């Protein structure tokens, strides 16, 4: 990727997560838990959709016959036509293969950005209550029950109501 979180520090994907594209997986006292993040996943899907809506259902122009498959046209004009057509085919073949590489390069980096945007946003919610190991994880330094986890997800985490507790364990 370009933002290094699709191959950089998230080592691998989660084949079990079919809820969405990006999501949370926590661990705490009550146990394990996995959920997907809608606001991010839909932000990339709405973007791929833009590309598809741009390449598909184009209303191409109307063209007519200048050749004849049954009664071949005159030679000198038949070559100017064969030649011209062969040239345009070069352009479109080039335009087609280049456009996909441009788009496929963009989509692959575009998804990174959505991962890094999620990651670097959750980190700000946990201002000084947690530290990031660097594997795509957040080591939380207070009791975070399954309600506290869901607090993070829908962005209700009040960093203040855990800070003094968290800062204590942070330095000892």
């Amino acid at each position: 990727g370009l933002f290094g979180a699709i191959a950089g520090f998230i080592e691998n994907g989660w084949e079990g997560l079919i809820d969405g594209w990006y999501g949370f997986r926590h661990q705490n006292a009550q146990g394990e838990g996995t959920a997907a993040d809608y606001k991010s996943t839909q932000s990339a899907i709405d973007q791929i959709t833009g590309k598809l809506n741009r390449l598909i259902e184009k209303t191409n122009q109307q063209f007519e016959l200048i050749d004849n498959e049954f009664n071949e046209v005159e030679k000198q004009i038949g070559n100017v036509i064969n030649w011209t057509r062969d040239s345009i085919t070069e352009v479109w073949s080039y335009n087609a293969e280049l456009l996909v590489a441009m788009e496929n390069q963009h989509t692959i980096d575009l998804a990174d950005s959505e991962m890094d945007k999620l990651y670097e946003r959750v980190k700000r919610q946990l201002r000084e209550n947690a530290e990031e190991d660097g594997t795509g994880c957040f080591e939380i330094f207070h009791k975070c029950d399954d309600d506290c986890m869901a607090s993070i997800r829908n962005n209700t985490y009040d960093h203040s109501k855990y800070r003094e507790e968290a800062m204590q364990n942070r330095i000892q």
Partner: protein, 53 residues
Amino acid sequence: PQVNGLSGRIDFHWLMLNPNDTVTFSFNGAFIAPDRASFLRGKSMGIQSGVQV
């Protein structure tokens, strides 16, 4: 060369009369005269194929 039993050939020529203009044929032989003229009804598309409709 023989085609449909005839070694003669007819050469078909054509022009397009504009409205209110006049076409005139002088001929003392070897003429295949038109009986009816032809007008275009609209727009369409022609193709060449050998498959079912």
